[PDB]
Amino acid sequence: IIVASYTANLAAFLVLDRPEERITGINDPRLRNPSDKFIYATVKQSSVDIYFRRQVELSTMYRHMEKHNYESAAEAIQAVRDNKLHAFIWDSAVLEFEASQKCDLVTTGELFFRSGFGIGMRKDSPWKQNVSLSILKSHENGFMEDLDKTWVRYQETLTFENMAGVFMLVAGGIVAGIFLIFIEIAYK
Amino acid sequence: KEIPRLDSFMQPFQSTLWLLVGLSVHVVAVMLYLLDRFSPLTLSSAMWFSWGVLLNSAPRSFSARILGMVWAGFAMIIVASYTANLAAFLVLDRPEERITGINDPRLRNPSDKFIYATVKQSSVDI
Amino acid sequence: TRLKIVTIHQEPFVYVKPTMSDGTCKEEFTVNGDPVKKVICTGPNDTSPGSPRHTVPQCCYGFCIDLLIKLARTMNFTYEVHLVADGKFGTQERVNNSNKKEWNGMMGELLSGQADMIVAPLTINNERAQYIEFSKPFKYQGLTILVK
Amino acid sequence: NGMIGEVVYQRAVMAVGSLTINEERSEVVDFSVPFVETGISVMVSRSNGTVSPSAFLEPFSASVWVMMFVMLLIVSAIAVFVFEYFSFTIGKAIWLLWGLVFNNSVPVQNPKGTTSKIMVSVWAFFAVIFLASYTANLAAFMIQEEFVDQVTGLSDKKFQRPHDYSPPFRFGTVPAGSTERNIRNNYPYMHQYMTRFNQRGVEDALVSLKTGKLDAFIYDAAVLNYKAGRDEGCKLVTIGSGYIFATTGYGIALQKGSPWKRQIDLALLQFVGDGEMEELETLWLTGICHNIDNMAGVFYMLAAAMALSLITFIW
Ligand SMILES: *[C@@H]1O[C@H](CO)[C@@H](O[C@@H]2O[C@H](CO)[C@@H](O)[C@H](O)[C@H]2NC(C)=O)[C@H](O)[C@H]1NC(C)=O
Ligand SMILES: *[C@@H]1O[C@H](CO)[C@@H](O)[C@H](O)[C@H]1NC(C)=O
Ligand SMILES: *[C@@H]1O[C@H](CO)[C@@H](O)[C@H](O)[C@H]1NC(C)=O
Ligand SMILES: *[C@@H]1O[C@H](CO)[C@@H](O)[C@H](O)[C@H]1NC(C)=O
C-alpha cells in the first residue's frame, strides 16, 4: 500500500499544476497596474506606440515603456535572452521563427490586432499599380507559400529528467555496496 | 448533467485484444511445443507455466527463456498501459455539459435539445 | 530606373553579412539546395553612440530581397538597395522650433526624396496612410506576447 | 453577374457587404483595404485523434535504455562473479534478473549468494522506482491533448489519385464561385477530380459533413471557423489556419474613380485601430472550441522477436 501510494504520488507530481504563470490575458488590468518585476518594453518610435497612444486606457503601459524604449528589437531579444525583460508585444511569425530557433522563447495564444504588412509607397505613381498587381500575382501562386516553406515552416515530458541524478545516486550506491561486500568478504 | 455510474472494463471497451492475447499465447504454446519436440506431464506443466507467466504472482528453457522473458515484459508493459489509460479514462472524463454562462454563442441559435424557458410573466423575462 | 531602396535591419528579413574578400557575397545554400540570392547594400555598424562613422557595402539578404528580385523579374526596372540611417520606424516627433511635430526615420527620408520605396513589413495604420499611399498588404500578421 | 454585374455596369455604386479578393475582380474594380484576415481553408470531417502511440520503447526510453542495459550487464557480471566465488547462474543470470524485474511468477532458484541477494534487492527497488516513473511518464504522455492529421498539404499524396489509398475520399465546391476560378488557376487536374464530386450549397455540404456523406470541403477560413465554433459535439474542425493556402482577405470593391474610397479606407483604418473591429469580432465570432487503441506495432516487434528466436533455434 505504501509503494502503491508512492507510485501514484510520482504520477501526481507531474499532474499539471501551474498551467501558465503569467497574466497573458491582454485585457487583464494587472498590467494596467504593474509591479517592479513586470518589465515590458517596446521599440522606440514604433507603430505599436502610436497604436497605444491612440487609445485612452494605455497610459500606464506607455509610461512604463517610455522608460524602457529600445532602439532595435534585437535589443529586446538580448534583454529577454538575459531575462531582463518579462513581456514584449511583437509580430507572431517572427516570434514563431525565434521559438524554432530557441525553445525558451514562447509565445502566447491570444492573437490580437490581426494586422497587414505591405510595402511603403509614394503617392500616385505608375510604379504603384503594376507593383500592386505583381503583389497580387505573388498572392495567387505559392510564392509566399514556399518562401515560408524555406524557413518559416521549417522549425529547427519524458523519462529523461528523472534519470540522471537517479543514475548517479544508484551507481554510487552500487559502488558503495560492492565496497561493503569487499568488507564482508574480508570479515569471513 | 448528472450522469449515473461499468467504467468500460470489457463490455463497453473493444473486445479484440483479449482474443488477440488468447491467440497469441496459443501461438506461444505452439512454438514452445515445437521447441519441445525439436529439443536440442510435461505438456500440462508447460501450459500451466505459460499461464503462470501471465498470472503475475519453470521447465527446460535453454532457448525458450528468451521467449518467456519477451512475453512477460510485453505482458507487464501492456497491463501497465491498460492501468494508465483506464485511470486516464476515469479521471479526465469531464466534458462541457452546461451552458457556461449567459454569454453562450451556442444558444444564440438553439435547437429542440437545449430546452430553456422561464417563469410566465417574470421580471427576469422583462 | 534609379530606385533608391531603403531598409531597416529586420532580424528575419534583412540579414546583413559583411563581404568575404572585396565587395563580394558568399554563394551560400538553403536547406534544399537553393542558393541564397544576396544583394549589395550600404550599412553602418550601429547608431551614433555605437560607431562614429563606418558605413560599408555589405551583403543584405533574407525575404524581401528575393521579393524585390521577383519584382525586378516581373517588371522592367532597376533598383538601388541601401539602409536607413537610424534604427527607428519614424514617428511624428517634435522639432526644436516652438514644438512643431514632424516626421523622421524612414518616412522622413522618403518624404525628403532621399528614398524611393520602403520595402519593410510596417504596421499599416491610419495617419501614415493619411499622408502617403501604401501598397496592398502582402503579410497577414498580428501581435502577441513573448515570454520565458 | 451578381454584384460584379451591378457595380461594373454601374447599376450599383458599391458592395458594402463582404466580398472575396482575387485577380480579375481587382482588375475590373478597386477593392478597399483588407479589413480582416480571411484566407481559404478546407473543412474536414474528423481527425479521429486517439491518444495511443504505435511505439512504446523509442519515444520513451532512448537515452535511458543504453545505461539500463549497461547497468544490467554489470549487475549480471557481478552475479556471475558471486556464483563462481562459492546452480545455473553461469550465463543464465540475465533471464533470472529480468524476470525478477517484473516478478511474473518466475520460479528460478533459492539464492544463497548474499552479495547476489543484496544486488537483487537493490536492483529490485530500482526496478520498482523506474516502473513507477514509467507509469507516471505514460500518464504525462496522456496529459497533453494531441490530434493526428491526415492531409497536411495542398500537394498531398492523396490528391494525386485515391486509388492508392483504400478509403476513397471526396471533396467539392459550389458552382459559379471564385473558389472554382482559384482552383482552376492552381490545378486543372484538381478541377477534374472536383467536377465529379460537385454539390449544391454551403449548408447542404454542412449536412453532408454531419451525416458523413462528405470528407473535405474547400471554402474560406473564418466563416468555417465560425461554423466550427458552433459545431455540435466539436467534430468538424479544420486543420491549421490557412497556412498552406493563398491567404486572401475581404474588401469593399468600389467603382474605379469613386471619391468616397479614401474616406472609406481611412474609416476602416480607424475601425481597426481602436478595438472597435475587435469588439465586432467578439460580437460575431466564437472560440470556446479548444483542443483508444492503436496497437499491433509492438506485435510486429513480437513477430520479429519470434523470427530471431527461430534463427537462434536452428543452431
Ligand atoms: C565598426 O566601425 C569601426 C570603426 O570604423 C571599424 O573598426 C576598424 O576596423 C578595421 C579593420 O579591423 C581596422 O583596421 C580599423 O583600425 C578600425 N578602426 C577603428 C577606429 O576601430 C569596424 O571595422 C566596424 N565593424 C565592422 C566589423 O564592420
Ligand atoms: C503597367 O504595365 C507596363 C509594364 O510594367 C507599363 O509599361 C505600363 O506603363 C504600366 N502602367 C500602369 C497601369 O502602371
Ligand atoms: C526593358 O527596358 C528596356 C529599355 O531600353 C528595353 O529596351 C527592353 O526591351 C526591356 N527588357 C525587358 C526585359 O523587358
Ligand atoms: C528645444 O526644445 C527643448 C525641449 O526641452 C527646449 O530646451 C527648448 O525649447 C529648445 N531649444 C533648446 C535650447 O534646447
Distance, CA of D285 to CA of D205 (rounded, Å): 21
Residues in chain C: 148
What secondary structure, in 3-state letters, does chain D show? CHHHHHHCCCCCCCCCCCCECCHHHHHHCECCCCCECCCEEEEECCCCCCCCCCCCCCCCCCHHHHHHHHHHHHHHHHHHHHHHHCCCCCCCHHHHHHHHHHCCCCCCCCCCCHHHHHHHHHHHHHHHHHHHHHHHHHHHHHHCCCCCCCCCCCCCHHHCCCCCCCCCCCEECCCCCHHHHHHHCCCHHHHHHHHCCCCCCHHHHHHHHHHCCCCEEEEEHHHHHHHHHCCCCCCCCCCCCCCCCCCCCECCCECCCCCCHHHHHHHHHHHHCCCHHHHHHHHHCCCCCCCCCCCCHHHHHHHHHHHHHHHHHCC
Chain C residues within 8 A (CB-CB) of chain D? 124-126, 129-130, 136-137, 140, 142
What is the grid cell recorded at C91? 514617428
Chain centroid offset of residue A144 CA: 24
SS3 (DSSP) at A11:
helix
Distance, CA of D122 to CA of A172 (rounded, Å): 12
Cβ of A126 below 6 Å from ligand 2: yes
Decide: residue D75, CB within 10 A, 0-12 exposed, 13-18 middle, 19+ buried: buried
Helix (H) or strand (E) holding C131: helix C126-131
Helix (H) or strand (E) holding A69: strand A69-70
Distance, CA of D29 to CA of D271 (rounded, Å): 23
Neighbouring C-beta atoms of residue A80, cutoff 10 Å: 21
C93 in Cβ contact with A46 (< 8 Å)? no
Which technique was used to obtain these atomic coordinates?
cryo-EM
DSSP states of A147-188 as a string? HIIIIIS-----TTTTSHHHHHHHHHHHHHHHHHHHHHHHH-
What secondary structure, in 3-state letters, does D198-213 show? CCCCHHHHHHHHHHCC
**Which residue has cell 499611399?**
C133
Residue C42 CA to ligand 1 centre (angstroms): 15
Distance, CA of A109 to CA of A107 (rounded, Å): 7
Residue C71 CA to ligand 3 centre (angstroms): 15
A114 in Cβ contact with C135 (< 8 Å)? no
SS3 (DSSP) at A56:
coil
* CA proximity to A167, closest of D120, D135, D64, D116: D64
Does the CB of D241 have a partner CB in chain A at under 8 Å? no
D255 in Cβ contact with D165 (< 8 Å)? no
Sequence-distant (≥ 6) Cβ neighbours of residue D205 within 8 angstroms: D172, D174, D199, D214, D217
Resolution of the structure in the document, Å: 7.0
Q: Please list, residue by residue across A159-185, b when 16 or more beta carbons sit within 10 angstroms of its beta carbon and e when fewer do.
A: beebbeeeeeebeeebeebeeebeeee
Cβ of A130 below 6 Å from ligand 2: yes
What is the grid cell recorded at B89? 479514462
Distance, CA of A3 to CA of A11 (rounded, Å): 12
Distance, CA of D286 to CA of D226 (rounded, Å): 6
Which residues make beta-bridge pairs with C35?
C29
- The helix, strand and coil proportions of chain B, stated in percent and rounded to the nearest 5, come to 50, 0, 50
What is the grid cell recorded at D204? 447542404
A46 in Cβ contact with A8 (< 8 Å)? no
A22 in Cβ contact with A50 (< 8 Å)? no
Distance, CA of B70 to CA of B61 (rounded, Å): 13
Distance, CA of D44 to CA of D47 (rounded, Å): 8
* CA proximity to C137, closest of D13, A91, D187, A41: A91
Cβ of C51 below 6 Å from ligand 1: yes
Distance, CA of D34 to CA of D251 (rounded, Å): 5
Q: Cβ separation of C126 and D270 shorter than 8 Å?
A: yes
Sequence-distant (≥ 6) Cβ neighbours of residue A74 within 8 angstroms: C9, C11
How far D281 CA lies from chain B's nearest CA (Å)?
Answer: 13
D64 in Cβ contact with D307 (< 8 Å)? no
Distance, CA of D173 to CA of D198 (rounded, Å): 6
D138 in Cβ contact with B84 (< 8 Å)? yes
